[PDB]
UniProtKB/Swiss-Prot annotation:
Domain PDZ: 6-89
Quaternary data: Monomer and homodimer. Interacts with the other members of the syntrophin family: SNTA1 and SNTB1; and with the sodium channel proteins SCN4A and SCN5A. Interacts with SAST, MAST205, microtubules and microtubule-associated proteins. Interacts with the dystrophin protein DMD and related proteins DTNA and UTRN, and with the neuroregulin receptor ERBB4. Interacts with PTPRN when phosphorylated, protecting PTPRN from protein cleavage by CAPN1. Dephosphorylation upon insulin stimulation disrupts the interaction with PTPRN and results in the cleavage of PTPRN. Interacts with DTNB.
UniProt record similarity statement: Belongs to the syntrophin family.
Cellular localisation: Membrane; Cytoplasmic vesicle, Secretory vesicle membrane; Cell junction; Cytoplasm, Cytoskeleton
PTM description: Phosphorylated. Partially dephosphorylated upon insulin stimulation.
Identification of the protein by name: Beta-2-syntrophin
Role this protein plays: Adapter protein that binds to and probably organizes the subcellular localization of a variety of membrane proteins. May link various receptors to the actin cytoskeleton and the dystrophin glycoprotein complex. May play a role in the regulation of secretory granules via its interaction with PTPRN.
Tissue expression: Ubiquitous. Isoform 1 is the predominant isoform. Weak level of isoform 2 is present in all tested tissues, except in liver and heart where it is highly expressed.
Modified residues (Phosphoserine): 20
Organism of derivation: Homo sapiens (Human)
Length: 95
């Protein structure tokens, strides 16, 4: 229930977003940013966070994307992307 943020990232002409993602519909997991590489495109936006859920990219919805579908969508979204993201507050409870 964290607010959604719409975040611009501009890729290098010879490069990508400068993140890793995990997750995907095949495991009922959202697409999440698992790494932001220092000084690369997403890091230069200063607007993304480790653990942000990527909900969509340039009008392409990723809330129910498989991992491979998310990867393709982000890779093909063009040189400038508007990402809709929502931070996931992870709570770990000992039980």
């Amino acid at each position: 229930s964290m607010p959604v943020r719409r975040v611009r990232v501009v890729k290098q002409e010879a490069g990508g977003l400068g993140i890793s993602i995990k997750g995907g519909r095949e495991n009922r997991m959202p697409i999440l940013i698992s790494k932001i590489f220092p000084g690369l495109a997403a890091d230069q936006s200063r607007a993304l966070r480790l653990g942000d859920a990527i909900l969509s990219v340039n009008g392409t919805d990723l809330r129910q994307a498989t991992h491979d579908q998310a990867v393709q969508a982000l890779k093909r979204a063009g040189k400038e992307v508007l990402l809709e993201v929502k931070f996931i507050r992870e709570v770990n409870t000992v039980v």
